[PDB]
Design a protein around this nucleic acid. Sequence first.
RNA 1: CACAGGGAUAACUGGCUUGUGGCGGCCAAGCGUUCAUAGCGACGUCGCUUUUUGAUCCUUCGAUGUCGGCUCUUCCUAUCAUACCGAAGCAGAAUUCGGUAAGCGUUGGAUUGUUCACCCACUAAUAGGGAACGUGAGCUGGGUUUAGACCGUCGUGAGACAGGUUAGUUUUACCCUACUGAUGACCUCAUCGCAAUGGUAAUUGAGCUUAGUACGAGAGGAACCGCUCAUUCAGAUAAUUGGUUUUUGCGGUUGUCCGACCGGGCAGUGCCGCGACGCUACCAUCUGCUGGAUAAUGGCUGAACGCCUCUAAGUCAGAAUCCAU
RNA 2: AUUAACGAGAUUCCCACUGUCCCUAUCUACUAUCUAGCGAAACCACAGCCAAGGGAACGGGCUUGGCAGAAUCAGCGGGGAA
RNA 3: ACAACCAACUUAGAACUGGUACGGACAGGGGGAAUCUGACUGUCUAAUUAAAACAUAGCAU
RNA 4: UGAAGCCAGAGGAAACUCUGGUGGAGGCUCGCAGCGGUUCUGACGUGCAAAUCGAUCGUCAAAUCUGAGCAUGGGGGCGAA
Lengths: 61, 385, 136
Amino acid sequence: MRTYDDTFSGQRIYPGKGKLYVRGDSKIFRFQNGKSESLFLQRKNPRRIAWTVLYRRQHKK
Amino acid sequence: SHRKYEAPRHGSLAYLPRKRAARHRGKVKSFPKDDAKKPVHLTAAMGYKAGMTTIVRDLDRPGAKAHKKEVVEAVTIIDTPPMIVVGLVGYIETPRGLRSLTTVWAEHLSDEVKRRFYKNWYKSKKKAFTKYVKKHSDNNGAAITRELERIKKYCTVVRVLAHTQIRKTPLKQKKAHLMEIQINGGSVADKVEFGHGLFEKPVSIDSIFEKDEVIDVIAVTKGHGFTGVTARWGTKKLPRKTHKGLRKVACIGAWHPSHVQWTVARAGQAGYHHRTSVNHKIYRIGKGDAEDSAATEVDVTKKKITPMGGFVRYGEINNDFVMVKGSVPGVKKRVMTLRKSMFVHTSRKALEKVELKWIDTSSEFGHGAFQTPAEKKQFQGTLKK
Amino acid sequence: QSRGAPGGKLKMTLGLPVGAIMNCADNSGARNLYIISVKGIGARLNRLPAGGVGDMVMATVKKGKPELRKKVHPAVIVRQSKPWKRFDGVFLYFEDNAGVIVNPKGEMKGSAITGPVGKEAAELWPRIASNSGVVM
RNA sequence: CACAGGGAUAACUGGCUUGUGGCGGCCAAGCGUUCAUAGCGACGUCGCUUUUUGAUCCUUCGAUGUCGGCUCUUCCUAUCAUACCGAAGCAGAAUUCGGUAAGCGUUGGAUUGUUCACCCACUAAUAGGGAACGUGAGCUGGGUUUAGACCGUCGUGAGACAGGUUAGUUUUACCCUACUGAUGACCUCAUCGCAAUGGUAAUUGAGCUUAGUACGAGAGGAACCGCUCAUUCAGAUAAUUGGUUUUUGCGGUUGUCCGACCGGGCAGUGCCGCGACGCUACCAUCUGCUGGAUAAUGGCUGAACGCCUCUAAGUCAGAAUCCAU
RNA sequence: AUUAACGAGAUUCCCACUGUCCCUAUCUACUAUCUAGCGAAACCACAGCCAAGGGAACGGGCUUGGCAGAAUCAGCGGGGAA
RNA sequence: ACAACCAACUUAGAACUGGUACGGACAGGGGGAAUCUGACUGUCUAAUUAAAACAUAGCAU
RNA sequence: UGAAGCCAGAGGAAACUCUGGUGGAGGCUCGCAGCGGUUCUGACGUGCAAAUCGAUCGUCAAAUCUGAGCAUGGGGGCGAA
Ligand SMILES: [Mg+2]
Ligand SMILES: [Mg+2]
Ligand SMILES: [Mg+2]
Ligand SMILES: [Mg+2]
Ligand SMILES: [Mg+2]
Ligand SMILES: [Mg+2]
Ligand SMILES: [Mg+2]
Ligand SMILES: [Mg+2]
Ligand SMILES: [Mg+2]
Ligand SMILES: [Mg+2]
Ligand SMILES: [Mg+2]
Ligand SMILES: [Mg+2]
Ligand SMILES: [Mg+2]
Ligand SMILES: [Mg+2]
Ligand SMILES: [Mg+2]
Ligand SMILES: [Mg+2]
Ligand SMILES: [Mg+2]
Ligand SMILES: [Mg+2]
Ligand SMILES: [Mg+2]
Ligand SMILES: [Mg+2]
Ligand SMILES: [Mg+2]
Ligand SMILES: [Mg+2]
Ligand SMILES: [Mg+2]
Ligand SMILES: [Mg+2]
Ligand SMILES: [Mg+2]
Ligand SMILES: [Mg+2]
Ligand SMILES: [Mg+2]
Ligand SMILES: [Mg+2]
Ligand SMILES: [Mg+2]
Ligand SMILES: [Mg+2]
Ligand SMILES: [Mg+2]
Ligand SMILES: [Mg+2]
Ligand SMILES: [Mg+2]
Ligand SMILES: [Mg+2]
């Protein structure tokens, strides 16, 4: 047992919840919910999404 | 073959008639076989469905693929405030079945019991059991003593009249659900003294059931109203070209017999049926006073079983609870009957001794990611509040 | 001897009925796998046979070397886009559906697998696990 | 194309019959390494069924909607598979014949309107039938089965063709019963119970071990117990995932309109992304017990019939069978 | 006999696409539904529970059995050879 | 090959910009390889058949 | 979309051939109204209607559509049949 981090938004992923996506390039992505999964599949940039962990780190918040 | 390609029948003939149950509280149709060697003990209890949640535990099943790995599985939480015992019923065995010989009521019945005997309690005079309490008082309660002697001498099956404490649950109802629980155990004399001593004394779910016990849960399922054939029986939907409706059975019978038969699927009532779901393993019997009901030996967070924001459409849990594996019939807030198993268990799965590892307490009102308000504040830092 | 079924496979979401086309994830020369049937399927009216990761199927090659075109080969599914969960409670899915041409005994016809391989495929078939790279 | 009629008379069901179709017996010439009867059984011969087609014309001509397919229920046994057994030209494995037994199953496709057939593939198995050749106020209309049209043969011609093509309106339930659910008067109201009767539900396979062991000269090659799963079916549930969006919840955006761009109206929900609750999917999760009486069969004691032998009196075990929980 | 272009003509295949289908689920509007008002028609020997028998050879009535308890509402499409 | 005063549309080029979205609603061809048949446009069985049927130009008597 | 006719340039010994414009022909083409009526064998089918309604569809500069006046009258008329 362990917790993971959403690769798009940095949210904590407790066991059972969320989804795991294996890109054909052998990459591994973890999503806490469908909101982050949809944005990832729409090839949005996590750094331009204002509620993500990466955005708050770039903008010093 | 005259049925060109044949398939198994849609639905079960063993659950007819599929009509609204004649009751709202699940009924124990049969009690266990009552071995006379075991000590006296109750065999049933009543609780209220609070909701579902998920857990993680280390499986233990030699030969299985996940023999020592962690498995995620759903559980159901049943709120069980302690029950009060207010009566004693004796049954005699007759060539026509079992017959209730006499009933003994303890004095000082609470208003929760007394409301069960009225439809308009608000404007009544509340005269229930007002002249009965004189039996306990007059002649040093000789009338009650005679009835107790009758039960010991004649009756072969003894049951207590149970009582819920719905005032301790977050439900708007004030009527308590009354029940008969059979005292399986020793001799008839032992059963009467066991039941008599339990008068007006609360009985906790701790004594009736253990942690690793396999139980049966009895409740009335979720109502769906008048529903069609495809929903009730799961028949194949008709092609989209059909003129007068698609969700129907095409042939409802042959020419002969010249009748519509009882084995043909027809639209009507679905749900709200009485069901007895069996072989449910208990995972935890939590305490209502403990502040760490959801805390395990691995997750040492002092968190209670109530998810963040409370159980959806139920509320919080401030009483004892039973954590049972899997799903059970009924809806939230529904009174549910827990009964001891009538079978003998020899499977390793049934005999397995469970030990929890983590209990989810994230909100069920959404995609909750935090298990406690403290964890939410450290992750999110400070807000404008 | 015996029939080509994964004898020990746990239940999983299938998401690949017959008539589906998988990418060929090995160097056998094929580029498609047309699923014509699944091994171990029972019998129920109108229900199409379906398989998931690690299930052996019979397939035909719609695109590839002419030596593999007009024949029926036993294949094994190693990827699928339909999400499925293991006993650990996590829901996993890949980018596309893929499979590898094998023989009746289970040995792979090719020698190298392109892309990730689902865990169930590796456990059930020793030769797929040997020739696979990243497995998750 | 029309009228008066006909069930005095055909085409579809039903009724009698069973040649024909199908199925089952008796005898024993032969086949089977020798050996009629393990398995077959010619020449003969006795039957049964009404799932084939005939024969007939009893009912219907002031009409019983006339093929098939889809859907759904139930019944039969002449048992394909599964349970338990007997026999073999049964060493093992595989297979063949037979007994109880219809409890439970008997598939996905290419071609054809097809029944049928023939292949591919899976499967424990892909058994055979009935219910007005079950089922058109259940569907469809592919065929058949009006009127249009084409071709070939036939006819001088109009026209004919179980010869071939293409296009061709499928009506009504609100009545009674039947079924599915839902109320309900009389015996004061209410709570807690009993249980007559009715229904009843489970199914099958694969891995590990047994074990490369028993068996067998090699090749080959089991099963009982015990676990672990999965197929079909059944009941339930909404923690997770997936679906659904009038939460018209928030955000984005197009064209107009409100006079200064905030906030809104309209485009029958303008469109797009996310979307909680609720509902919901072997697209998700959980669960599905055990007595007793037997059938075939193998036995015990034991006469009839001083010997014997499962039966005659008595009696034991025993099937997915019957009854009950 | 062959034909470019054309065809709400008939036929076969391939790509894309999709609830046709595996296997169904959910949402909206208007009905159905309940109420106030208004208010028909087809049809109708008499009526309306079965099993078997016989009978003009497929009965609601006959015979022998099974049985059988007021009054009703919403659906339904087996029967009334409707 | 100039200077001054007017004019309303069309086209082209470049920075910047945005959750890479932009014919953002509306409006708005699915395509290909063939076979049979009629050349094509046109016409008819109002109220079950729009067709390969009729017609047509051309040819012939 | 772009036929005749017309303008300019280029190539060639010549015959003549190319390129860019202009022009606006066709029982041409996409498509709105009108006209029609292919499919859903959709709705309705004691209907709104003794033939209508919805989507989809055919044609859309002409062998297109159409009003009024007039002619043809029953073994007769009229008929792209
Ligand atoms: Mg049939
Ligand atoms: Mg229709
Ligand atoms: Mg005849
Ligand atoms: Mg015969
Ligand atoms: Mg006749
Ligand atoms: Mg006659
Ligand atoms: Mg007639
Ligand atoms: Mg008649
Ligand atoms: Mg009829
Ligand atoms: Mg038999
Ligand atoms: Mg017949
Ligand atoms: Mg009918
Ligand atoms: Mg015709
Ligand atoms: Mg001739
Ligand atoms: Mg004829
Ligand atoms: Mg019973
Ligand atoms: Mg369900
Ligand atoms: Mg969701
Ligand atoms: Mg949801
Ligand atoms: Mg003896
Ligand atoms: Mg009768
Ligand atoms: Mg009658
Ligand atoms: Mg009489
Ligand atoms: Mg009578
Ligand atoms: Mg009827
Ligand atoms: Mg109806
Ligand atoms: Mg017409
Ligand atoms: Mg027409
Ligand atoms: Mg012509
Ligand atoms: Mg138009
Ligand atoms: Mg129309
Ligand atoms: Mg229609
Ligand atoms: Mg109607
Ligand atoms: Mg004019």
